[PDB]
Design a protein around this motif. Structure first.
Motif, PDB file in Angstrom:
ATOM      1  N   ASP A  38       0.854  -1.291  -0.080  1.00  0.00           N
ATOM      2  CA  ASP A  38       0.075  -0.054  -0.065  1.00  0.00           C
ATOM      3  C   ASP A  38       0.888   1.155   0.003  1.00  0.00           C
ATOM      4  OD1 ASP A  38      -1.776   2.099   0.509  1.00  0.00           O
ATOM      5  OD2 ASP A  38      -2.916   1.094   1.875  1.00  0.00           O
ATOM      6  N   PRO A  39       1.046   1.809  -1.286  1.00  0.00           N
ATOM      7  CA  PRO A  39       1.966   3.027  -1.270  1.00  0.00           C
ATOM      8  C   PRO A  39       1.616   4.164  -0.577  1.00  0.00           C
ATOM      9  CG  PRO A  39       0.767   2.726  -3.183  1.00  0.00           C
ATOM     10  CD  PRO A  39       0.378   1.525  -2.511  1.00  0.00           C
ATOM     11  N   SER A  40       0.033   4.117   0.080  1.00  0.00           N
ATOM     12  CA  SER A  40      -0.359   5.399   0.980  1.00  0.00           C
ATOM     13  C   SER A  40       0.082   5.062   2.502  1.00  0.00           C
ATOM     14  CB  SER A  40      -1.726   5.402   0.962  1.00  0.00           C
ATOM     15  OG  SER A  40      -2.292   4.235   1.556  1.00  0.00           O
ATOM     16  N   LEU A  41       0.673   4.054   2.723  1.00  0.00           N
ATOM     17  CA  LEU A  41       1.181   3.727   4.121  1.00  0.00           C
ATOM     18  C   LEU A  41       2.481   4.462   4.273  1.00  0.00           C
ATOM     19  CD1 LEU A  41       0.966   0.022   4.551  1.00  0.00           C
ATOM     20  CD2 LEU A  41      -0.386   1.795   5.792  1.00  0.00           C
ATOM     21  N   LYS A  77       3.715   6.784  16.231  1.00  0.00           N
ATOM     22  CA  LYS A  77       2.929   7.645  15.116  1.00  0.00           C
ATOM     23  C   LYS A  77       3.258   7.219  13.859  1.00  0.00           C
ATOM     24  CE  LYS A  77       3.435  12.319  15.444  1.00  0.00           C
ATOM     25  NZ  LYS A  77       1.922  12.236  15.262  1.00  0.00           N
ATOM     26  N   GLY A  78       2.449   7.817  13.131  1.00  0.00           N
ATOM     27  CA  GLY A  78       2.786   7.301  11.383  1.00  0.00           C
ATOM     28  C   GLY A  78       2.455   6.063  11.106  1.00  0.00           C
ATOM     29  N   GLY A  79       2.921   5.525  10.013  1.00  0.00           N
ATOM     30  CA  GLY A  79       2.635   4.370   9.605  1.00  0.00           C
ATOM     31  C   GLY A  79       1.192   4.170   9.191  1.00  0.00           C
ATOM     32  N   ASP A 186      10.118  -1.921   7.882  1.00  0.00           N
ATOM     33  CA  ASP A 186       9.017  -2.503   7.146  1.00  0.00           C
ATOM     34  C   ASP A 186       7.942  -3.248   7.967  1.00  0.00           C
ATOM     35  OD1 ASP A 186      10.470  -1.128   5.147  1.00  0.00           O
ATOM     36  OD2 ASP A 186      11.382  -3.088   4.411  1.00  0.00           O
ATOM     37  N   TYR A 187       6.850  -2.998   7.615  1.00  0.00           N
ATOM     38  CA  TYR A 187       5.855  -3.627   8.321  1.00  0.00           C
ATOM     39  C   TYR A 187       4.565  -4.044   7.550  1.00  0.00           C
ATOM     40  CZ  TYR A 187       3.504   0.809   8.009  1.00  0.00           C
ATOM     41  OH  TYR A 187       2.897   1.942   7.447  1.00  0.00           O
ATOM     42  N   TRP A 188       3.950  -5.124   8.138  1.00  0.00           N
ATOM     43  CA  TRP A 188       2.588  -5.333   7.794  1.00  0.00           C
ATOM     44  C   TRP A 188       1.516  -4.867   8.859  1.00  0.00           C
ATOM     45  CZ3 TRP A 188       5.995  -9.729   8.220  1.00  0.00           C
ATOM     46  CH2 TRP A 188       6.518 -10.339   6.960  1.00  0.00           C
ATOM     47  N   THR A 189       0.188  -4.723   8.345  1.00  0.00           N
ATOM     48  CA  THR A 189      -0.598  -3.870   9.208  1.00  0.00           C
ATOM     49  C   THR A 189      -1.938  -4.285   8.906  1.00  0.00           C
ATOM     50  OG1 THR A 189      -1.568  -1.830  10.416  1.00  0.00           O
ATOM     51  CG2 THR A 189      -0.924  -1.734   7.949  1.00  0.00           C
ATOM     52  N   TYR A 190      -2.831  -4.616  10.031  1.00  0.00           N
ATOM     53  CA  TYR A 190      -4.070  -5.168   9.944  1.00  0.00           C
ATOM     54  C   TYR A 190      -4.935  -4.689  10.987  1.00  0.00           C
ATOM     55  CZ  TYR A 190      -3.546  -8.974  13.000  1.00  0.00           C
ATOM     56  OH  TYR A 190      -3.278  -9.742  14.336  1.00  0.00           O
ATOM     57  N   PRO A 191      -6.516  -4.761  11.156  1.00  0.00           N
ATOM     58  CA  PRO A 191      -7.043  -4.372  12.250  1.00  0.00           C
ATOM     59  C   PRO A 191      -7.341  -5.776  13.177  1.00  0.00           C
ATOM     60  CG  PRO A 191      -8.550  -4.555  10.550  1.00  0.00           C
ATOM     61  CD  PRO A 191      -7.370  -4.788  10.099  1.00  0.00           C
ATOM     62  N   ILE A 252      -4.534  -7.451   4.869  1.00  0.00           N
ATOM     63  CA  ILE A 252      -3.223  -7.163   5.510  1.00  0.00           C
ATOM     64  C   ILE A 252      -2.541  -6.529   4.509  1.00  0.00           C
ATOM     65  CG2 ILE A 252      -0.997  -8.054   6.541  1.00  0.00           C
ATOM     66  CD1 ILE A 252      -2.431 -10.711   7.708  1.00  0.00           C
ATOM     67  N   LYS A 253      -1.957  -5.267   4.950  1.00  0.00           N
ATOM     68  CA  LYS A 253      -1.357  -4.363   4.018  1.00  0.00           C
ATOM     69  C   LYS A 253       0.071  -4.361   4.340  1.00  0.00           C
ATOM     70  CE  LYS A 253      -5.306  -1.779   3.686  1.00  0.00           C
ATOM     71  NZ  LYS A 253      -5.959  -0.535   4.077  1.00  0.00           N
ATOM     72  N   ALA A 254       0.961  -4.353   3.346  1.00  0.00           N
ATOM     73  CA  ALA A 254       2.521  -4.279   3.471  1.00  0.00           C
ATOM     74  C   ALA A 254       2.781  -2.793   3.295  1.00  0.00           C
ATOM     75  CB  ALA A 254       3.152  -4.983   2.582  1.00  0.00           C
ATOM     76  N   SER A 255       3.834  -2.345   4.130  1.00  0.00           N
ATOM     77  CA  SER A 255       4.570  -0.977   4.014  1.00  0.00           C
ATOM     78  C   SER A 255       5.457  -1.229   2.756  1.00  0.00           C
ATOM     79  CB  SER A 255       5.144  -0.516   5.068  1.00  0.00           C
ATOM     80  OG  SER A 255       6.361  -1.527   5.405  1.00  0.00           O
TER      81      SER A 255
END
Length: 257
Positions: A38-41, A77-79, A186-191, A252-255
Motif C-alpha cells: 500500500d503506497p499510501s502507508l 505515530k505514522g505508519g 518495514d511492516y505489515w498492518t491489519y485491524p 493485511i497491508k504491506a508497507s
C-alpha cells in the motif's frame, strides 16, 4: 481462570470471552503473497528516546515491562496510524522449543517468540478508555529467532530470576526499548484484537518484517519462569501463545514492495 493449558487454554477462552469468536481476532497468519503493498502507508515513527521504564512484573501469563505513560514520552505515530499512541508496556510470547512461540505466523512459519509493544491512543485519555475503541491501541509486534544474542535484551533476562513466580515484580528503571528493535521498520498492518483475554477488538497491529535475533541462552531464561505463584506446584511458563485466528473480512497491508 484462563491460561494456556489443556483445560484453560485458547480453545476454552470463548466461554468467558465470547468475542474470542469475533470478526477481528488476533493473531493471524500473514500470507506474504496476498498482503498487498500500500503506497499510501507511511513510515513508522518510533520515538522512544524519553521512554521511562519503571517496573517488570510476572503476571502469571507473561512478564510485563511497564512504562510511565503519564506524558508523551515514548510514542508511536505514522505508519497506518492517525494521531499519537503512548507506550504503556511490552511483553513477550514464547515456546517450549525454538520451533514455536510466536502468535503471528508468516506463511505458517512460527518464530521462537514474539515481542509486543503496546501503545494507547492519546485521544482517549487513558488505557482503560482506549481499549473500548476500535482505534484505541497500536501494538508493534516483533518476531524473535534464535541465533546471535540481542545485547539490548540481556538486562531483561538478567532480572527474571527475581520475578520467577506469579505476582512478583521488581524495579526496572532506565531500560531502553530501542535496543529491542530490528534494523528495518518495514511492516505489515491489519485491524485486530488483544491476544489475551479480554480479547478486545481495539488494536491496529503493526508487525515488523525483520525478526530480531536472540541467543538460545536468552530464550532458555524465559522458559525458567513460572506460571504458578510462590510455593505452588511448578509449571514452567512456556507456550504462552494464542494460535492464529481466522482472517475473516480483513486485509493485511504491506508497507514495502
Amino acid at each position: 481462570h484462563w491460561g494456556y493449558g489443556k483445560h484453560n487454554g485458547p480453545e476454552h477462552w470463548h466461554k468467558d470471552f465470547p468475542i474470542a469468536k469475533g470478526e477481528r481476532q488476533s493473531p493471524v497468519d500473514i500470507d506474504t503473497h496476498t498482503a498487498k503493498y500500500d503506497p499510501s502507508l507511511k513510515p513508522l515513527s518510533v520515538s522512544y528516546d524519553q521512554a521511562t521504564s519503571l517496573r517488570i512484573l510476572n503476571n502469571g501469563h507473561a512478564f510485563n515491562v511497564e512504562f510511565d505513560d503519564s506524558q508523551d514520552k515514548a510514542v508511536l505515530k505514522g505508519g497506518p496510524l492517525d494521531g499519537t499512541y503512548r507506550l504503556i508496556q511490552f511483553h513477550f510470547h514464547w515456546g517450549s522449543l525454538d520451533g514455536q512461540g510466536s502468535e503471528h505466523t508468516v506463511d505458517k512459519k512460527k518464530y521462537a517468540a514474539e515481542l509486543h509493544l503496546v501503545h494507547w491512543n492519546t485521544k482517549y485519555g487513558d488505557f482503560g478508555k482506549a481499549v473500548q475503541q476500535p482505534d484505541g491501541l497500536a501494538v508493534l509486534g516483533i518476531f524473535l529467532k534464535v541465533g546471535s544474542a540481542k545485547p539490548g535484551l540481556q538486562k531483561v533476562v538478567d532480572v527474571l530470576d527475581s520475578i520467577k513466580t506469579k505476582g512478583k515484580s521488581a524495579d526496572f528503571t532506565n531500560f531502553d526499548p530501542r535496543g529491542l528493535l530490528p534494523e528495518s521498520l518495514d511492516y505489515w498492518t491489519y485491524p485486530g484484537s488483544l491476544t489475551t483475554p479480554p480479547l478486545l477488538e481495539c488494536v491496529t497491529w503493526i508487525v515488523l518484517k525483520e525478526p530480531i535475533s536472540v541467543s538460545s541462552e536468552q530464550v532458555l531464561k524465559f522458559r525458567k519462569l513460572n506460571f504458578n505463584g510462590e510455593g505452588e506446584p511448578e509449571e514452567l511458563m512456556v507456550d504462552n501463545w494464542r494460535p492464529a485466528q481466522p482472517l475473516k473480512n480483513r486485509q493485511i497491508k504491506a508497507s514495502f514492495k
